[PDB]
Design a protein around this ligand. Structure first.
Ligand SMILES: *[C@@H]1O[C@H](CO)[C@@H](O[C@@H]2O[C@H](CO)[C@@H](O)[C@H](O)[C@H]2NC(C)=O)[C@H](O)[C@H]1NC(C)=O
Lengths: 111, 49, 118, 44
């Protein structure tokens, strides 16, 4: 139902790199930066990436974000057991003149 | 800022025109209509700030 | 930012909504708590933002004037009430300090949240 | 702006001020900039 579309659940082996996609139009993705939030199951969401390039110090280097035109990709990388979380892509929207968010992807840690 | 700065404030309602170099800290609601009001903002009195 | 929030509430459809978000360990006059709800499987959903000073607020374009967000500086709380109550409303309501720059802009630290089932 | 002067060993004891003449030198200036219309002294 969200304006920004994300995969429902992406899984990967521990150590592997997992890519989460966020697709939309240039009004909110092209015109405004994409950011990625993560919330662990049962916990309040913590900032992962904001403005696509900087991170809040604690985040390890594996988490990176890229924005190309109307698309965005967050390569989580270095999959660990605690990666399992809901991932949301967020951006300002000029048509709605407010924050809009993605559908959310459930990261899964495989055996 | 990216969100669009909203913190800066300006007063649009005042009981008189201040002389040069005046500052006021109280931001009590300024009454516009004839009926006085007390407490919170409402009819005939809006927030000056 | 301890981030105090009210408990989970299930008053049923056609009833009322109560979401108090208490600031703690910080200055509330410069820190607001904008509201975001999560629809199950639909990710984060924006509902509105508040300004503790003056009293200005902004609501979601999808949402009508029925949503009511206010702030109390003396008790350092953010009060959110939604008049509408339908099956789609069922969500967890999270309020976050809005980053920095006098803290009205973009979400950083969400609180525990309030699961409302309708 | 505060100007001050002090006359010592005044021998006008009973009630009244002397029939003298002196000026008050400038002492202090500060930008307080607030509405003042009333004042009171302070005892100790
Ligand atoms: C500074 O304070 C004084 C005292 O409160 C104000 O004097 C008032 O002046 C108005 C004239 O418009 C009178 O109607 C009021 O009766 C006065 N007050 C009192 C208590 O008698 C003065 O206006 C204040 N300065 C400013 C710029 O507002």
């Amino acid at each position: 139902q969200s304006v920004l579309t994300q995969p429902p659940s992406a899984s990967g082996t521990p150590g592997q790199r997992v890519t989460i996609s966020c697709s939309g139009s240039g009004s909110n993705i092209g015109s405004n930066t994409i950011n990625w939030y993560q919330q662990l199951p049962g916990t309040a969401p913590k900032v992962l990436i904001y403005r696509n390039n900087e991170r809040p110090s604690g985040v390890p280097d594996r988490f990176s974000g890229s924005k190309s035109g109307t698309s965005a990709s967050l390569t989580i990388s270095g999959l660990q057991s605690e990666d399992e979380a809901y991932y949301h892509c967020a951006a300002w929207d000029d048509s709605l003149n407010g924050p809009v968010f993605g559908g959310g992807t459930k990261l899964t840690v495989l055996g | 800022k990216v969100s669009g700065n909203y913190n800066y404030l300006y007063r649009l309602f005042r009981k008189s025109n201040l002389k040069p170099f005046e500052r006021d800290i109280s931001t009590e609601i300024y009454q516009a209509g004839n009926k006085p009001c007390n407490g919170v903002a409402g009819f005939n009195c809006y927030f000056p700030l | 930012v301890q981030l105090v929030q009210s408990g989970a509430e299930v008053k049923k459809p056609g009833s009322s909504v109560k979401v108090s978000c208490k600031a703690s360990g910080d200055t509330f006059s410069s820190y607001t708590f904008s509201w975001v709800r999560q629809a199950p499987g639909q990710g984060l959903e924006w509902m509105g933002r508040s300004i503790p000073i003056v009293g200005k607020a902004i609501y979601a374009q999808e949402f009508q004037g029925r949503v009511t967000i206010s702030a109390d500086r003396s008790t350092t709380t953010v009060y959110m009430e939604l008049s509408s109550l339908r099956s789609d409303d069922t969500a967890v309501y999270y309020c976050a300090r809005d980053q920095s720059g006098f803290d009205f802009f973009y979400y950083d630290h969400w609180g525990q949240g309030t699961l409302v089932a309708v | 702006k505060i100007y001050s002067k002090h006359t010592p060993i005044l021998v006008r004891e009973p009630e009244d001020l002397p029939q003298g003449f002196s000026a008050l030198e400038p002492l202090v200036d500060l930008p307080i900039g607030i509405n003042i219309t009333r004042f009171q002294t302070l005892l100790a």
